[PDB]
Amino acid sequence: VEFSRIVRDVERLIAVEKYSLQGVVDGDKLLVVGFSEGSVNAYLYDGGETVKLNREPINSVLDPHYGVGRVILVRDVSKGAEQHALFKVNTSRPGEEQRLEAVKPMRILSGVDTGEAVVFTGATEDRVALYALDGGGLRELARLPGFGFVSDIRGDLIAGLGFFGGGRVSLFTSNLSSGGLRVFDSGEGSFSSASISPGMKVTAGLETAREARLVTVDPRDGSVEDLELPSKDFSSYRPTAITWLGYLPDGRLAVVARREGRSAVFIDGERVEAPQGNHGRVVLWRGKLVTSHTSLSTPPRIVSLPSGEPLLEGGLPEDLRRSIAGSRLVWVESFDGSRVPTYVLESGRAPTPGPTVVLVHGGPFAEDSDSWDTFAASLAAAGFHVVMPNYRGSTGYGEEWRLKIIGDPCGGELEDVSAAARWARESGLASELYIMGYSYGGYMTLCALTMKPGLFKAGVAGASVVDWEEMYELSDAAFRNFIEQLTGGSREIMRSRSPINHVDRIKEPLALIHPQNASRTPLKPLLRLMGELLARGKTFEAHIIPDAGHAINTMEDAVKILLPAVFFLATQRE
């Protein structure tokens, strides 16, 4: 088909600037970070115009207290390095950077700038520690028992989140003046967000096996109670996650919470009209609410609420814009009676019924939400509708649903994926069906083509697992433990659920995209698969790529990993 058009469109989708809202600084300017093709810059936004604060690209910026007249840039000390330096920029003098020399190179994990002290967590060779940098120099407030993140500061009280053991995220506090550490264990749940009330309590999002709650943790005694808000929109929403929360300067509590792959914005419990998708932090700016917004049809952008009008968004050309046309959540009926929550991104370049890709997510412990995805957008741009099923094993729909995969790889979850394909069929969406996925999704491609021949017209398997038994034996102890958990410790399940053992059954074209030198997705087992495919007469395409990396950031990453899947599907279509 139209190869150069697909490439031009992929270039634009890769290059589109994506924005996140960091806070309000200086006198009522938005601090926003923009990401374009693996390059991060920080900006002041003030009504139409953006002004870049940093010189060379950065990693991130620390969280500013409302109105502070400076920004703290976090920047990799080397190309790719996992160690950082801190640089201050005065908001009145953008582009002029002052290296914070008192802070040696370390892995900067998080931070908040009070305007009087930069309070941050960092990992060195020796430790993870909470630090404060002020006029007198650098102080270590506390050593932390593992990775921790500062969430908020009000006066001398510091609140944060810690991966301090037990499998879940604890809350912690420290004191700006005297340091120390107080940890508040999350019990059956896991803390997701925290902000300090004007009354010096820690409001926190506490995610659980089912619904998330908003709790008040008293830092004087560790008492935890459900926090009741003046408006009951938030509690009647029944969130499963709490993304972020924060007190606004007027003392009202802003909460962003999620359920079923989309978020909602609340101010003192009252829900605010917001564009469908997912949202980030909320600020009050010139007396109006502002957030970031993303969806399957919309790259991360800054919007005004309640209108949803974009204040800052990357440009896509009209033609590409119209190709990526609208997302929706459908509950697909599987075999169990179970209902598989499935996102659908419609293509403006495909008729209905049209060519449809079931794009299976990796993990498996991950979620397909209504959030911008370069892969789904590229497929839509190339004239495919995209179906993204949260097969059992997925996160975002409670622990019971995630746990269903355990013991049963290439079982119920493959039935869920197949259920989503039949639904695409059964609803009038799909004229023809393809499967594509990476990581566990690549494994699902192979499982589909082996266990459900005739379901899909062709399949793309990226960074797939081909044989659990071999993998278990090749692997490091972390990955070995996962394989042991997934398979229920049965060598018999390792074998029967391994697609290399069922190559005879494949009847459809298969494209393999695979890293040449990735430690946890090794090439040898894939060479075996290809040998098995060739021996048994099967149509296959293969692309073996050195240094594939682990995110599609640049056009080069896309050309290596995404383009071959798209060109392969486009040629299989016609």
Next chain:
Amino acid sequence: PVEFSRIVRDVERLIAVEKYSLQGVVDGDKLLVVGFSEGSVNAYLYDGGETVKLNREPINSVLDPHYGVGRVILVRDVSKGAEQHALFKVNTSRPGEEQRLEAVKPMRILSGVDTGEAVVFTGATEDRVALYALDGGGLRELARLPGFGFVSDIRGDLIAGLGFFGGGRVSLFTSNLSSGGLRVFDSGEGSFSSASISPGMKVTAGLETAREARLVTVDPRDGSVEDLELPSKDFSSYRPTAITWLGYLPDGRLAVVARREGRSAVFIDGERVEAPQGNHGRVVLWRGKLVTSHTSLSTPPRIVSLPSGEPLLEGGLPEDLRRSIAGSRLVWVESFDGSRVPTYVLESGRAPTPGPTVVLVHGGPFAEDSDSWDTFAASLAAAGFHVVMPNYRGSTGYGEEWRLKIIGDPCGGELEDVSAAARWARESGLASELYIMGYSYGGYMTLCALTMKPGLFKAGVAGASVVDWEEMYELSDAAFRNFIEQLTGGSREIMRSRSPINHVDRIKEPLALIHPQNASRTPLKPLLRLMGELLARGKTFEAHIIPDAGHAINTMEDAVKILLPAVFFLATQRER
């Protein structure tokens, strides 16, 4: 930053450009052309400024028609690129309706002629190469051939052809439609090159000797050979080194296309006929005028009238792509033993001088880089690489002696010629950095260069490559087993010692492997073993295996998939 979308747009347009091959004259004076158009290889009748498509699904070729026959025999791969072909008849009055010739099971069809009453062809199966005759009554094996063999011409009961029956030498052969059998004629002077049966039932053949070519008359009844005297001396004074094609026209005149230094000339009964600079194919008589094909490094294959040179059918390139070729030249590179390697150089209008340069190594090995259109070289020129195309020993076009030097010595003197062309590029001031790329025997040469000459090139692209002579032999059809024997001088030691899979530890440069999965000449299995070795020995590489495709690419999509990875790879290396 690599200009990916610009590269794809250029590569797609250069692939897409229509290309034509002249095949004969059928029915009511209609030209029979094979054309790449609408993204695939098809067969067409041309007459009265219009084409009519004969086939439905894409094809590979057609059999040579006798003049005025009322059908065309399509040759189509029915094995998704593995080159097991079937034959399909189309009546010229009913284009687009195909009758499969079911009496011929799929096999590798090598050549053929359709008299209108007998379809005569050569084909290779697992156990033999054979000359076949097919009629309304059935299929006959006229003779088994001791190697690759090709039907050249039929007049009456007499069949003439050419055979690779030993030592890289080409023999003439005859058979009889009525009675079959095989007579082989070998020259002690060189190799026969094309053949056509005179009205007097002699076989006129090109004879390529050590350093020149000439025309001879072979009497098939007693095997006598004499020089053919022509009524014009232009041919003889032209001093050709190779014969491209010859054929008797219906009016009895003898058309000869002969060449030297990678450009051809057209002669009718010895007389030189004005033709566009480049290379020409077959000459046909159409409505009393001469028509041939024409190509050059800047000119995709087209069909032209002689002596005007005016095209009847041609594809056009847009100005931007036309300017991306700044020029071409033949240079003579001095090799390791003093031999002068005739080397075509395609200068990019998009590269500085000195600039990034690709040594693009031809396949075969019995093939040549000439002043003839090369899609791959044009794509490289468009992506900002100069292209150096060396006629390493084993190449055609420069005499039997140069061609036969390769026999028994793969990855020997011919690799030194490739390496000397590379050195010349750098030493002459053309090349700022050097890459190697090739397909088939050319991909063998990439692998041989990176194993035997580490550090000469910055990076290599090996497409459809020979990896291991030994395993390829075991997997080869009767024809290819024989050919492999000839190339290796029958030595299993040469088979091992000259296979790059046995020298993977020596590789120091980045390598891109490209291979059609159903390639039946250079199979995929040894490539998978090469990948295992590269991995075991900690070498960095990328690989691209193309589905439902083989050696003979006949669609735009498969061409894009075999070419684009190479250009992307080289573009990226250039920024390294």
